[PDB]
Amino acid sequence: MLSPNVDTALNMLTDVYTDFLGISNYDATCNSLFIGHVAKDPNWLVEVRSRTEILRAVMNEFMQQKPKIFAQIITSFINYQTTFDACAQNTSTKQWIECLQLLQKTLKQNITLTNEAQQVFTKSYNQAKNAEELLASSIQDGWNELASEEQAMVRIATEIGSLSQSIASLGANVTAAQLRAGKAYIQSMVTISYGVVMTTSVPFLSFAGALFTVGYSAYSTISSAKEVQQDLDKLTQLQTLASEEAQAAAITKAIIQTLSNMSEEFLKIDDSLPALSLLWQDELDKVNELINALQSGSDPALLTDLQTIKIASASWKTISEFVQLISLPPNVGKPVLVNTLNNTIQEQ
Numbered sequence: 001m002l003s004p005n006v007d008t009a010l011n012m013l014t015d016v017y018t019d020f021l022g023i024s025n026y027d028a029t030c031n032s033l034f035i036g037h038v039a040k041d042p043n044w045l046v047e048v049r050s051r052t053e054i055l056r057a058v059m060n061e062f063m064q065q066k067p068k069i070f071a072q073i074i075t076s077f078i079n080y081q082t083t084f085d086a087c088a089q090n091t092s093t094k095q096w097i098e099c100l101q102l103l104q105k106t107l108k109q110n111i112t113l114t115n116e117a118q119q120v121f122t123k124s125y126n127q128a129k130n131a132e133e134l135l136a137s138s139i140q141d142g143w144n145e146l147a148s149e150e151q152a153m154v155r156i157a158t159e160i161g162s163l164s165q166s167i168a169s170l171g172a173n174v175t176a177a178q179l180r181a182g183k184a185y186i187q188s189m190v191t192i193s194y195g196v197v198m199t200t201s202v203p204f205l206s207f208a209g210a211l212f213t214v215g216y217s218a219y220s221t222i223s224s225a226k227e228v229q230q231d232l233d234k235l236t237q238l239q240t241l242a243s244e245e246a247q248a249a250a251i252t253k254a255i256i257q258t259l260s261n262m263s264e265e266f267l268k269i270d271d272s273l274p275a276l277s278l279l280w281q282d283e284l285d286k287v288n289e290l291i292n293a294l295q296s297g298s299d300p301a302l303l304t305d306l307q308t309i310k311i312a313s314a315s316w317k318t319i320s321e322f323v324q325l326i327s328l329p330p331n332v333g334k335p336v337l338v339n340t341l342n343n344t345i346q347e348q
């Protein structure tokens with residue numbers, strides 16, 4: 001069997017796709033991030049605005065490799081099935097070896113370019129972790145000079161984090177049985193726009209992120225979610241007990257706190273990509289053992305991996321068809337703005 005376990009293979013394809021999606025919008029979250037000014041506009045805030053400008057720029061290196069690496073792993077399974085069908089036909093023993101080492105070269109290329117793809121993410125993880133700690137340290141200075149309102153500020157930062165996590169629960173989980181069955185996902189950008197109030201309202205921060213829905217619209221699931229409306233209303237109450245700076249201090253801490261948790265989804269790549277590289281690796285171990293057996297003079301008939309090649313190519317066709325589905329660009333739903341200084345939920 002010159003093919004992997006199609007069930008175990010398609011899960012590892014989904015796990016590197018899942019870890020791509022959860023990462024591919026950490027960029028979009030970073031570009032969408034906006035930070036305006038407060039009343040006095042103290043030092044830590046001017047400092048925070050600057051360090052988000054470099055957080056956006058720190059990720060610009062990986063941001064332009066994400067579509068390259070993804071298409072590189074998509075095409076690695078599609079092209080491999082193409083050259084594999086060339087060798088499943090039957091017929092000289094010399095011809096089998098010439099065909100096998102064509103796979104052996106392509107296999108070697110695929111495992112190499114996979115392990116190099118894993119190092120690009122490991123660098124952008126530490127880069128994202130670096131620019132985060134700068135923001136974390138920078139807001140922390142604003143916290144300490146506003147310590148008389150710590151309890152008031154912990155509640156505001158905890159509510160913004162609760163609001164963000166309840167909108168995250170409405171999102172569909174991307175699995176293998178879903179994608180193999182042809183079910184199409186919908187990616188919609190959810191802008192949450194915070195602000196700082198004082199008898200009125202003033203806009204301030206606004207960051208965005210993707211929500212995955214299976215069949216309904218993103219607006220439908222959010223406006224009809226009651227947990228979202230209970231976090232939205234609780235926040236309005238909390239942002240009236242704290243001063244102008246304390247609100248901005250509490251808001252920014254929670255945006256960073258979600259960025260930190262968002263970035264920790266990078267670490268799952270350090271388990272999914274190597275498992276994908278291992279998929280090619282012990283697949284190369286199969287074609288190596290067959291070449292050695294042919295070169296040593298074994299009758300090609302008595303090599304079971306060679307007889308059962310028609311069932312092997314049929315399994316590669318299933319894997320190639322699974323990769324052609326996740327390669328399609330996701331359906332773009334209508335974006336929805338969750339405006340927290342108005343308790344309003346529109347759809348743009």
